[PDB]
Each structure stands twice: as C-alpha cells, then as structure tokens.
Motif scaffolding. Structure first.
Motif, PDB file in Angstrom:
ATOM      1  N   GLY A  49      18.885  27.718  19.423  1.00 32.42           N
ATOM      2  CA  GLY A  49      19.497  26.493  18.865  1.00 32.42           C
ATOM      3  C   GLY A  49      21.011  26.617  18.712  1.00 32.42           C
ATOM      4  O   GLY A  49      21.650  25.615  18.411  1.00 32.42           O
ATOM      5  N   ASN A  50      21.584  27.794  18.928  1.00 30.06           N
ATOM      6  CA  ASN A  50      23.044  28.008  18.776  1.00 30.06           C
ATOM      7  C   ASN A  50      23.767  27.258  19.889  1.00 30.06           C
ATOM      8  O   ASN A  50      23.199  27.128  20.973  1.00 30.06           O
ATOM      9  N   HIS A  51      24.975  26.784  19.607  1.00 37.78           N
ATOM     10  CA  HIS A  51      25.887  26.151  20.592  1.00 37.78           C
ATOM     11  C   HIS A  51      26.849  27.214  21.119  1.00 37.78           C
ATOM     12  O   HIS A  51      27.159  28.156  20.377  1.00 37.78           O
ATOM     13  N   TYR A  52      27.261  27.081  22.377  1.00 39.20           N
ATOM     14  CA  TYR A  52      28.227  27.986  23.037  1.00 39.20           C
ATOM     15  C   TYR A  52      29.144  27.164  23.934  1.00 39.20           C
ATOM     16  O   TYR A  52      28.858  25.990  24.206  1.00 39.20           O
ATOM     17  N   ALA A  53      30.252  27.780  24.323  1.00 37.18           N
ATOM     18  CA  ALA A  53      31.182  27.264  25.341  1.00 37.18           C
ATOM     19  C   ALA A  53      30.888  28.018  26.637  1.00 37.18           C
ATOM     20  O   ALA A  53      31.155  29.235  26.690  1.00 37.18           O
ATOM     21  N   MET A  54      30.312  27.325  27.615  1.00 40.81           N
ATOM     22  CA  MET A  54      29.957  27.901  28.930  1.00 40.81           C
ATOM     23  C   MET A  54      31.110  27.601  29.883  1.00 40.81           C
ATOM     24  O   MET A  54      31.305  26.437  30.235  1.00 40.81           O
ATOM     25  N   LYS A  55      31.850  28.624  30.278  1.00 41.40           N
ATOM     26  CA  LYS A  55      32.909  28.475  31.303  1.00 41.40           C
ATOM     27  C   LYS A  55      32.226  28.634  32.656  1.00 41.40           C
ATOM     28  O   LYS A  55      31.587  29.675  32.872  1.00 41.40           O
ATOM     29  N   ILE A  56      32.356  27.627  33.514  1.00 46.12           N
ATOM     30  CA  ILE A  56      31.837  27.651  34.904  1.00 46.12           C
ATOM     31  C   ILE A  56      33.007  27.952  35.830  1.00 46.12           C
ATOM     32  O   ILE A  56      33.923  27.128  35.890  1.00 46.12           O
ATOM     33  N   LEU A  57      32.979  29.123  36.473  1.00 51.21           N
ATOM     34  CA  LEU A  57      33.975  29.548  37.484  1.00 51.21           C
ATOM     35  C   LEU A  57      33.354  29.409  38.871  1.00 51.21           C
ATOM     36  O   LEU A  57      32.407  30.143  39.158  1.00 51.21           O
ATOM     37  N   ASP A  58      33.857  28.470  39.671  1.00 50.87           N
ATOM     38  CA  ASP A  58      33.512  28.281  41.102  1.00 50.87           C
ATOM     39  C   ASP A  58      34.020  29.510  41.857  1.00 50.87           C
ATOM     40  O   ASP A  58      35.240  29.723  41.854  1.00 50.87           O
ATOM     41  N   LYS A  59      33.125  30.272  42.495  1.00 49.53           N
ATOM     42  CA  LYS A  59      33.491  31.527  43.200  1.00 49.53           C
ATOM     43  C   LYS A  59      34.500  31.196  44.303  1.00 49.53           C
ATOM     44  O   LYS A  59      35.518  31.876  44.395  1.00 49.53           O
ATOM     45  N   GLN A  60      34.273  30.130  45.061  1.00 47.52           N
ATOM     46  CA  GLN A  60      35.136  29.770  46.212  1.00 47.52           C
ATOM     47  C   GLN A  60      36.553  29.514  45.697  1.00 47.52           C
ATOM     48  O   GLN A  60      37.509  29.960  46.357  1.00 47.52           O
ATOM     49  N   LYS A  61      36.691  28.877  44.533  1.00 52.51           N
ATOM     50  CA  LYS A  61      38.021  28.565  43.955  1.00 52.51           C
ATOM     51  C   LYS A  61      38.687  29.872  43.506  1.00 52.51           C
ATOM     52  O   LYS A  61      39.861  30.076  43.854  1.00 52.51           O
ATOM     53  N   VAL A  62      37.957  30.739  42.799  1.00 55.94           N
ATOM     54  CA  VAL A  62      38.480  32.041  42.294  1.00 55.94           C
ATOM     55  C   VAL A  62      39.033  32.841  43.477  1.00 55.94           C
ATOM     56  O   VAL A  62      40.120  33.408  43.324  1.00 55.94           O
ATOM     57  N   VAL A  63      38.321  32.881  44.610  1.00 58.07           N
ATOM     58  CA  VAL A  63      38.781  33.600  45.837  1.00 58.07           C
ATOM     59  C   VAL A  63      40.059  32.932  46.353  1.00 58.07           C
ATOM     60  O   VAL A  63      41.065  33.640  46.548  1.00 58.07           O
ATOM     61  N   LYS A  64      40.019  31.613  46.547  1.00 58.73           N
ATOM     62  CA  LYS A  64      41.146  30.814  47.099  1.00 58.73           C
ATOM     63  C   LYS A  64      42.429  31.074  46.292  1.00 58.73           C
ATOM     64  O   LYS A  64      43.480  31.215  46.907  1.00 58.73           O
ATOM     65  N   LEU A  65      42.340  31.152  44.963  1.00 55.24           N
ATOM     66  CA  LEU A  65      43.506  31.347  44.055  1.00 55.24           C
ATOM     67  C   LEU A  65      43.790  32.842  43.872  1.00 55.24           C
ATOM     68  O   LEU A  65      44.653  33.164  43.045  1.00 55.24           O
ATOM     69  N   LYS A  66      43.078  33.718  44.587  1.00 57.13           N
ATOM     70  CA  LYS A  66      43.248  35.199  44.544  1.00 57.13           C
ATOM     71  C   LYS A  66      43.171  35.729  43.106  1.00 57.13           C
ATOM     72  O   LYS A  66      43.993  36.590  42.771  1.00 57.13           O
ATOM     73  N   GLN A  67      42.198  35.271  42.312  1.00 61.43           N
ATOM     74  CA  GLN A  67      41.977  35.704  40.902  1.00 61.43           C
ATOM     75  C   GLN A  67      40.679  36.525  40.790  1.00 61.43           C
ATOM     76  O   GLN A  67      40.091  36.570  39.665  1.00 61.43           O
ATOM     77  N   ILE A  68      40.251  37.173  41.882  1.00 58.68           N
ATOM     78  CA  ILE A  68      38.961  37.914  41.929  1.00 58.68           C
ATOM     79  C   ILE A  68      39.042  39.094  40.966  1.00 58.68           C
ATOM     80  O   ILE A  68      38.188  39.161  40.048  1.00 58.68           O
ATOM     81  N   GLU A  69      40.015  39.988  41.177  1.00 58.54           N
ATOM     82  CA  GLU A  69      40.152  41.248  40.397  1.00 58.54           C
ATOM     83  C   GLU A  69      40.243  40.877  38.918  1.00 58.54           C
ATOM     84  O   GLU A  69      39.550  41.517  38.124  1.00 58.54           O
ATOM     85  N   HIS A  70      41.020  39.847  38.577  1.00 61.37           N
ATOM     86  CA  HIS A  70      41.306  39.458  37.165  1.00 61.37           C
ATOM     87  C   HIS A  70      40.010  38.965  36.518  1.00 61.37           C
ATOM     88  O   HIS A  70      39.685  39.452  35.428  1.00 61.37           O
ATOM     89  N   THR A  71      39.289  38.061  37.187  1.00 61.03           N
ATOM     90  CA  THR A  71      37.982  37.525  36.724  1.00 61.03           C
ATOM     91  C   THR A  71      37.017  38.695  36.454  1.00 61.03           C
ATOM     92  O   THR A  71      36.429  38.750  35.363  1.00 61.03           O
ATOM     93  N   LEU A  72      36.853  39.604  37.426  1.00 61.51           N
ATOM     94  CA  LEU A  72      35.901  40.746  37.332  1.00 61.51           C
ATOM     95  C   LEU A  72      36.305  41.625  36.155  1.00 61.51           C
ATOM     96  O   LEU A  72      35.451  41.961  35.321  1.00 61.51           O
ATOM     97  N   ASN A  73      37.588  41.970  36.100  1.00 65.96           N
ATOM     98  CA  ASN A  73      38.163  42.844  35.051  1.00 65.96           C
ATOM     99  C   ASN A  73      37.913  42.183  33.690  1.00 65.96           C
ATOM    100  O   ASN A  73      37.324  42.833  32.797  1.00 65.96           O
TER     101      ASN A  73
END
Ligand SMILES: Nc1ncnc2c1ncn2[C@@H]1O[C@H](COP(=O)(O)OP(=O)(O)NP(=O)(O)O)[C@@H](O)[C@H]1O
Ligand SMILES: [Cl-]
Length: 322
Positions: A49-73
């Motif tokens: 029943g708890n509420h959360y903030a779900m961040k949805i990261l599109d993998k294709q966008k993360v790659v395109k913006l070269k934020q792979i290492e940062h996201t993983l880290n």
C-alpha cells in the motif's frame, strides 16, 4: 562498531540487487514530472500500500545521450548505501524497453530553488544544512566513495526540512587518487583543474563552496567564461561579504584551501577538524544525525500516457549489470 555499515555496503557492492520488483506489482496513480530519460510516476506498491516515485529511464535515450556509465554507477551506489541524508532506492528492475528506479516518495522542495528564492541563508540555517553534508561525506568517504558533485541542485529538502542527496551519477568508488575532469566549474576543486590527480579532499573543497553560496547567496568563484572561474579557483583568493562572521571566514579559509595537504577534512584528525571548528560549536552532531533538531524550513506538500514495453529487448548489452 560501524565496521557493520562498511561490511553491509561491501556485500551489496560485490553482489548488487537486481530485478527486486516488476511493473505488474505497482498501481500507476499519475505522472509526477519529466526527467532526462523519461517520466517519474507516483505508484502504489499493490502488496504493501506504500506510494513511491518510479523513475522510468528509456534505455535507447540513455545510450543516445551517452549517460550509460552514470546511470549504472548511480544505481549500483544507491543499492549499496544506507544513510539518513541519501535518497532511498526502494526497488530496481529492467524490461525490454526501460530501467526502473523505484525511489522513496519525497514530497519536499529543491535546495536550489529555496536558496535562489530566499536569496541567502542565515549562518545558523546554512550550518544546519552544512552539518548534514559533513556527516554524509564522513559516511561516503568511509566507503572510499568520492561524491565530487556537491552543489544545491543535487540537494532536496524532505518533509522534515532535512537534506537528501539526490544524484550519484559522478560519484566514484576509489581507494587512492583518480583523474577524471568532471563536475560544474563553480564547484571544481583546484587539484581537479590542475590535472595531476585528486582524492576525496575535493568533497571538502566543495563543502566550502556550498557553505559560502548558502551564506552569501552566490558562490565564491564566478565569471562569464569558465577559464576566468578556473583562474580564480587556482590562483585567485576569495572575497568574503562583510556580513560573514569571523568563525565562518576562518572555516572557509581552511575548506577553500587551494593546497589539499592543508585542507580541513584531509589532515590527521580528518572530519573532526570540521566538526570541532568554532563555527560548528553549537551543532549537536548526534542530534542532526537522528533528525532531532527542528529544521528552519518545511516545504508545503488528464495528460496521462500509458507505458509501452516492446516485445523486443533494447540495449541488453549496455545495461547487463543493472
Ligand atoms: N523521490 C521523489 N519524490 C517525489 N517526486 C519526485 C521524486 N523524484 C523525482 N520526482 C519528481 O520527478 C520530477 C523529475 O524527476 P527528477 O528526479 O527531477 O529527474 P532527473 O532525470 O533526475 N533530472 P533533474 O530534474 O535535473 O533532477 C521532479 O521534478 C519531481 O517533481
Ligand atoms: Cl567540467
């Protein structure tokens, strides 16, 4: 006996938790806002029943913006750490299309916009926030984590008026020195600019910069072109506003110490040189850690699109570790 905080971090660092929930376990209430790589959605965990903030990261966008290492880290650090002033990652999973970071729902405000709106903070209010950062850097440093990205933009104010560090993209786990030129100009430590290697002392530099910016309403080093800011950081001095207490100016002289071998936080007594400084004489360190000090600021607390997940896997390789 907090060799247990280290032991537990290290278990999670060595075996990061993966797919600890799935999409069908959450009710989608509404979109809270948009991030770099997709929406953040208010969700109800169906079981609890708890509420959360779900961040949805599109993998294709993360790659395109070269934020792979940062996201993983960022994800890898957030599933290992446990400290009152770090945002809590509750669950993470991936599917064919997206990464999911299910964060604690924090209906707070932003330090950046509160600082900019008020103009500047009183020394006692700056000190309240600064003490949370000091205890946070003590935690991170005991895990060989260099945050190296402090600034108001990276700090939110929760519903109790306390700090949570919101961003770990840049943070690096490393025992000795590292070399990566990274951060924002106004908050770069001089040993980073001089490109001969730096260590965790750059965080104490950045604390100095943040305290100054909280107390003055603007940072110590600023200019129209970054090279002018680098010049100031490396071989300029600082100018304190006349309203700054002599306690504050003395602390800042020792945090904004251009020579890292003499910077407070990086000597034999380590963090105690900051904690035992005159400026912090009124700070109850235990009480700040326990959130028992009354905070000076308490934040006040149709166009809905579905999530489509592909039947085809995207960017499997890039995000194997997630
Ligand atoms: N833990 C949270 N609790 C409540 N709202 C949140 C939370 N995390 C994000 N949000 C909301 O989601 C919006 C966008 O997510 P956010 O975390 O800001 O994105 P980002 O990709 O990290 N980029 P940035 O906006 O620069 O921080 C924010 O403006 C908030 O309104
Ligand atoms: Cl940079």
């Amino acid at each position: 006996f907090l060799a247990k905080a280290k032991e537990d971090f290290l278990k999670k660092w060595e075996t990061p938790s993966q797919n600890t929930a799935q999409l069908d376990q959450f009710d989608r209430i509404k979109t809270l806002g948009t991030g770099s790589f997709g929406r953040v959605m208010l969700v109800k965990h169906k079981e609890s029943g708890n509420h959360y903030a779900m961040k949805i990261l599109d993998k294709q966008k993360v790659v395109k913006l070269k934020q792979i290492e940062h996201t993983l880290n960022e994800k890898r650090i957030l599933q290992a750490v446990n400290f009152p002033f770090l945002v809590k990652l509750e669950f993470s999973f991936k599917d064919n299309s997206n990464l999911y970071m299910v964060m604690e729902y924090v209906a707070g405000g932003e330090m950046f916009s509160h600082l900019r709106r008020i103009g500047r903070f009183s020394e006692p209010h700056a000190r309240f926030y600064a003490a949370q950062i000091v205890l946070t850097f003590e935690y991170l440093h005991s895990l060989d984590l260099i945050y190296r990205d402090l600034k108001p933009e990276n700090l939110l104010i929760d519903q109790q008026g306390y700090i949570q560090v919101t961003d770990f993209g840049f943070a690096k786990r490393v025992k000795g020195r590292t070399w990566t030129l990274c951060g924002t100009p106004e908050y770069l430590a001089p040993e980073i600019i001089l490109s001969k290697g730096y260590n965790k002392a750059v965080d104490w530099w950045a604390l100095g910069v943040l305290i100054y910016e909280m107390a003055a309403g603007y940072p110590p080093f600023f200019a129209d072109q970054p090279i002018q800011i680098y010049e100031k950081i490396v071989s300029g001095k600082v100018r304190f506003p006349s309203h700054f207490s002599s306690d504050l100016k003395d602390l800042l002289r020792n945090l904004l110490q251009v020579d890292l071998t003499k910077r407070f936080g990086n000597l034999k007594n380590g963090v105690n040189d900051i904690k035992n400084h005159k400026w912090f004489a009124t700070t109850d360190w235990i009480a700040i850690y326990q959130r028992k000090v009354e905070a000076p600021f308490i934040p006040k607390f149709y166009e809905e699109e579905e999530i489509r997940v592909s039947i085809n896997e995207k960017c499997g390789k890039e995000f194997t570790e997630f």
